[PDB]
């Protein structure tokens, strides 16, 4: 009967997500906290050759004209299946030990970990969709894969004005992609925060034309998610969706309305961000395992990944 | 609650496939090759450009890379209608009913592996596909939810070449190089999934690839002993090595049927009905699954088949 708190910390690349989280998990005992970092040791080397120099050098030359459209989406699109790799592993075995939502005692174990798998699955391709480098049927593959919801899934996004954000970055410095970037993960906040007053994007389709994911109104369609597949590829003589496409919106709208997502503010000292970042941890979601050696076994998993690939 | 009974028709194309299943009222709907999402819908003639890039890699005309990042993306188009289906067809899926009728019957030309494992492994066999591409969409395949019944094939391979050649679809090359990889890849399939239900841990066995189931080199898991995959002290890195682990658990659950198509289409037919028999039901989980996953068969077959 133990309880696990599991802890994404996501949102655009960077807002200072790493040292927050190492520094967290330095003020905690090594035995009831446990980072999976970034998989460094699989992007670099292992899963491929150097994915994060192609992906911004395929932008660039996309950019300046020097390859198709078509070119720079299968480039793209075969990145990020390989990027997303790590994640949903990760996911899919630790899948089988998570239980129900017991509330938000300390848990007996604290997970933290650098990104969840929508960030490869659905943000960054919707970033790249938005950058011209990736068709939205290639995006909407992606969000039909993403593995289902677990339990207490704590998604922690950033929060840090632009300019304070572009002047992190200054030490490709695509300043386009970072406004892209930053657009998807507001649009994810609007649209969990959608989903969870009720929102249905069916319902509300026709209101298209032309962020605070746990609290205040409802957002209008229009700032969430689903405003992205607008897009003439998608739409059928009649002028709707094909239904195909619309079951991957479903599938969208399924796997966001049960996260629980929290707003980190990174307009602040290193220390500072991770006092924040430990008091919106204490009205997180925990869960119970479903054995009672789970806590030992996702415990070795998590270290083993993190000294594979980050390390 | 009502009971349904999944069937998926696969293994390598042009057995008769497609043919077979056509040929075998409302208590029976069948989801098709959603060919008009591949050539048009998804992406402008995606199995021309797939046998393209291959033909072009055979001519030495792209390097082994090109073909690669073509090829995996190719694969995601080809595969996302399946993975849409089952992710919306999912939580309709109830548990087993076990050992009468079933209220609907539902017939897929192919189960979400042909896309997330199968054709990417072949792939990998004929060059065009890292190893890693192919265990990043093994890290993908949906769950093994009950009742998930599958279908694959037996055919001499002079008979299938013969059926393959008269039935080639729109931008495909006779390719026997990519038959044999294909045909490979499914008899390894089949082994795998006996082996797993008879107790093979690959783990326990991946020794022996160095040196009652089959041998765990007739299986899938030799695949993945590909240098890429591997550190320089020959160990699997455990990324992969934790891929297989789901491989083994989504592979395992399955149940494997075997349709001899060294017959005529008739006879076909009839050996497939015959095999529904042992075949697993489940119950649906809510009163209006019936009608809903209905709706979903027949809108999936008016949009995207042929």
């Not at 970092?37 to 950019?63: F, K």
């Not at 995006?139 to 922690?156: E, H, K, R, W």
């Not at 998807?184 to 007053?197: D, E, I, M, P, S």
């Amino acid at each position: 009967m133990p309880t696990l708190l599991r802890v994404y910390i996501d949102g655009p690349h960077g807002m200072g997500k790493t040292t927050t989280t190492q520094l967290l998990v330095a003020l905690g005992s090594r035995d009831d906290i446990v980072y999976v970092p970034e998989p460094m040791t699989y992007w670099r080397v292992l899963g491929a050759s150097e994915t994060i120099a192609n992906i911004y050098t395929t932008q660039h030359r996309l950019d300046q004209g020097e390859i198709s459209a078509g070119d720079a989406a299968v480039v793209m699109t075969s990145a990020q299946i390989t990027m997303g790799m790590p994640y949903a592993v990760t996911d899919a075995v630790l899948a089988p030990h998570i239980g129900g939502e017991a509330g938000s005692p300390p848990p007996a174990l604290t997970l933290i970990f650098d990104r969840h798998p929508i960030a490869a699955l659905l943000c960054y391709p919707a970033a790249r969709y938005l950058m011209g480098s990736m068709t939205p049927q290639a995006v909407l593959a992606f969000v039909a894969l993403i593995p289902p919801t677990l339990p207490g899934t704590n998604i922690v996004l950033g929060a840090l004005p632009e300019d304070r954000h572009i002047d992190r970055l200054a030490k490709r410095l695509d300043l386009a992609m970072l406004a892209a970037i930053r657009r998807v993960y507001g649009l994810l906040a609007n649209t969990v925060r959608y989903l969870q007053c009720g929102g249905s994007w069916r319902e509300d389709w026709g209101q298209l034309s032309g962020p605070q994911s746990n609290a205040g109104p409802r957002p209008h369609i229009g700032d969430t998610l689903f405003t992205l597949f607008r897009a003439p590829e998608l739409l059928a003589p009649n002028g709707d969706l094909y239904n195909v496409f619309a079951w991957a919106l479903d599938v969208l709208a399924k796997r966001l309305r049960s996260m629980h997502v929290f707003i980190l503010d990174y307009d602040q000292s290193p220390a500072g961000c991770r006092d924040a970042l430990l008091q919106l941890t204490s009205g997180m979601v925990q869960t119970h395992v479903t054995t009672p050696g789970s806590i030992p076994t996702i415990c070795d998993l998590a270290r083993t990944f993190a000294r594979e690939m980050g390390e």
